[PDB]
């Protein structure tokens, strides 16, 4: 990890990350066969098996009764794309002919690759443990109609077997037929491994996904098709990580304020967040819910990314004298804050705030000065800005400094309007 403290804009760019981008959705279809459970009844008062039967039947029936701020823009588009794709494939599957074809394909095996009439190819899995149990053990155990059988083993086995079905029903009913994430009941680890190995991508991506399958699970989700006969049919929309090991970097900033004649003039870069490179294409991922780091690799979603121009990387070098319209917020009220960076921390504190750095060994090391200041992690462990203790990160990497008169201090700000929320740096300074 290489971090460069760009003192021109009180910002730090931390490069050395290896991209993991999701390029497509892989659809997996499940038929959680429940069995002929609605035809069975209990007629000897309360029992463990009666309670489990009532729970299952209620679950089934209630299941039948169901179904430019770039960050905002990007996350909205991402959620829209995900829901639209899931709903479209669910619509293609909801046809009776399509469901019958899927069942026929899965009739003699537990996994088959069916080409849907809509032209898309989707994997299919059959979760038949619950149906096999309900048909071979439960049905012949509760004969006549007596659920108060002496065998407690049967009741406990029923509870274990229907755990998955009841959990799936809970998730779908609570979320109204669309879960936000893949529980371990929607798709187990082995099933996720099989779906990863069946993905239409290359060996490197497949191996990386085999290693980060729980990240895959975090980024996936599920959807309920419907209840057909006595079988719950749902699908899982898994993410395809078709790109791996590509350059990426993150930008952080803090208010670069400068006092003169008792008044201040602050600025804050609004183009913060993650970036990545893809075969001559730089992609901005500005919304804060889709880009997660894990060590050196950064996982992001390409549907939530904006295709920014290449040139945009010049704001990290000569933001002041670059022809790209770099984005910055502006104002005249100082804000004192600590903007923690991956390897260091930017400390801003001005009139009326006291700063100081330290460590667990000695409370106080020194009293920081006024203005923006880069505190290296190797230098200290914690920093204070007024009874507020921030603990620095302990990641290892070389920290750099890029000397240069800060823009806030070197230019005369625009008199009116000064407070601009998100504008080109031209409008604010040196207008």
């Amino acid at each position, epitope marked *: 990890l290489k971090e460069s403290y760009l003192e021109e804009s009180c910002s730090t760019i931390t*490069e050395g990350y290896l991209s993991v981008l999701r390029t497509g959705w892989y659809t997996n279809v499940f038929t959680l066969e429940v069995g002929d459970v609605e035809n069975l009844t209990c007629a000897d008062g309360p029992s463990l098996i009666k309670t489990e039967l009532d729970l299952t039947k209620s679950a089934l029936r209630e299941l039948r009764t169901c179904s430019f701020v770039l960050g905002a823009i990007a996350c909205g588009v991402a959620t829209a794309a995900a829901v639209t794709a899931g709903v479209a494939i669910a619509k293609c599957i909801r046809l009776e002919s399509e469901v019958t074809a899927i069942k026929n394909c899965l009739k003699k095996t537990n996994e088959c690759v069916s080409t849907l009439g809509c032209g898309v190819r989707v994997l299919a899995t059959a979760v038949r443990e619950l149906k096999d149990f309900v048909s071979k053990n439960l049905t012949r155990a509760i004969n006549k109609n007596k659920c108060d059988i002496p065998d407690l083993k049967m009741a406990v086995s029923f509870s274990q077997f229907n755990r998955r079905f009841l959990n799936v029903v809970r998730q779908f009913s609570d979320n109204a037929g669309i879960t936000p994430a893949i529980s371990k009941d929607l798709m187990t680890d082995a099933e996720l491994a099989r779906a990863i190995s069946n993905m239409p991508t290359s060996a490197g991506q497949i191996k990386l996904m085999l290693e980060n399958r729980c990240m895959v699970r975090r980024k996936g989700f599920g959807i309920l098709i419907g209840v057909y006969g006595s079988s719950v049919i749902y699908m899982v929309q898994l993410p395809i990580f078709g790109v791996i090991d590509t350059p990426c970097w993150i930008v952080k900033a803090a208010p670069s304020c400068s006092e003169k004649k008792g008044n201040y003039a602050c600025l804050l870069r609004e183009d913060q967040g993650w970036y990545c490179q893809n075969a001559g294409s730089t992609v901005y991922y500005p919304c804060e819910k889709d880009c997660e780091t894990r060590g*050196d690799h950064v996982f992001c979603d390409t549907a939530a990314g904006i295709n920014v121009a290449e040139q945009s990387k010049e704001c990290n070098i000569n933001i002041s004298t670059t022809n790209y319209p770099c984005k910055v917020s502006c104002g005249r009220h100082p804000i004192s804050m600590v903007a923690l960076s991956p390897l260091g921390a930017l400390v801003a504190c001005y009139k009326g705030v006291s700063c100081s750095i330290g460590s667990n060994r000695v409370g106080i090391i020194k009293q920081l000065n006024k203005g923006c200041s880069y505190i290296t992690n190797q230098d200290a462990d914690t920093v204070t800005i007024d009874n507020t203790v921030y603990q620095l990160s302990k990641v290892e990497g070389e920290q750099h400094v890029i000397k240069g008169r800060p823009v806030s201090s070197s230019f005369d700000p625009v008199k009116f309007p000064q407070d601009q929320f998100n504008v080109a740096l031209d409008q604010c300074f040196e207008s």
Partner: antibody
Amino acid sequence: QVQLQESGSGLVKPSQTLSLTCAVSGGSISSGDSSWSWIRQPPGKGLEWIGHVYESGNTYYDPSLQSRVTISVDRSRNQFSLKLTSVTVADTAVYYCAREGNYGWDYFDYWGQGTLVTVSS
Amino acid sequence: DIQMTSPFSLSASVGDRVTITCRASQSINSYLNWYQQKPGKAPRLLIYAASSLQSGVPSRFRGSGSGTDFALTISSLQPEDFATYYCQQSYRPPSRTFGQGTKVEMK
């Protein structure tokens, strides 16, 4: 902390292919600085840059030497190597591996000792 | 590939004003670098951007100038400041050519 140490064959027969390698101790290639670059210094003239590679795999090469150079990097072993073909008499010099000073986009901050191949007869 | 004209060598005494000049054919803007190499040793990065001073370098090495004039100056020469000083261009890779080299020796 960081020490680039050239390695290879000290005896290279004439008309063969030019092979070179570099290493980094006390640091990593995969996320080092980047731009693991290469250099040669022919007797008579000065220093000349051949090409470099990045921690991911981007590989820039000299316009008037890129037809023969294939500079590769290996993030696992932490070594970026060199491969120069069509060696001539003018290609007898001191070759250096180095690390780049990502100020604007590239500058040199670290150099190796220098691997020299001597021809005696 | 590109040839630049500069003095072959220069001599002076300790504490003299040492000035160097590195010419370019195309354009450099601010992507110019300075290296010092002793005999039998690798070059040393002293200035990056032609105006930024690398950490841990004596203040004597400095570079100023605006417009069309640029040059490296050494005000307080030191006994360990006798060596060949190249220059490098990082404008438009992969065209990165060092200078022929300038050597400073005592008189």
